[PDB]
Specification:
Layout lengths: L4 H10 L10 H12 L6 E3 L5 E3 L4 E2 L29 H12 L8 H6 L15
Antiparallel strand pairs: 1-2, 2-3
Helix pairs in contact: 1-2
GO molecular function, one term: identical protein binding
Protein name: Lysozyme C
EC number: 3.2.1.17
Amino acid sequence: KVFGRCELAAAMKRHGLDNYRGYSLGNWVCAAKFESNFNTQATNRNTDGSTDYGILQINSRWWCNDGRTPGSRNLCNIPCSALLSSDITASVNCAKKIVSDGNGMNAWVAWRNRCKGTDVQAWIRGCRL
């Protein structure tokens, strides 16, 4: 599924991400844009041989199991393929674990380089308040 911008924002707000660990909804939508372009099926291999999965490009090194990442912890206790569903529930519950882990949303390098410090509430502009 390719989510629309306000569509994704309403799904993330309904699953509890607006203001989670102090991060406003605009932050999470901005990260989803530059991680996956709102595409739940997006996958991208990392140079260390792990792969990132889904809307928020959750990485198989630490968070989900894909069977091909020597060392994987699978801390969200989830197959990485289940992060590619049209229903973002698994991805949101796992992202809640990642942002809570110590370095906040800086865990998403795309958030740190392209979203952090920017007017992120522009990402929920026009969406039903």
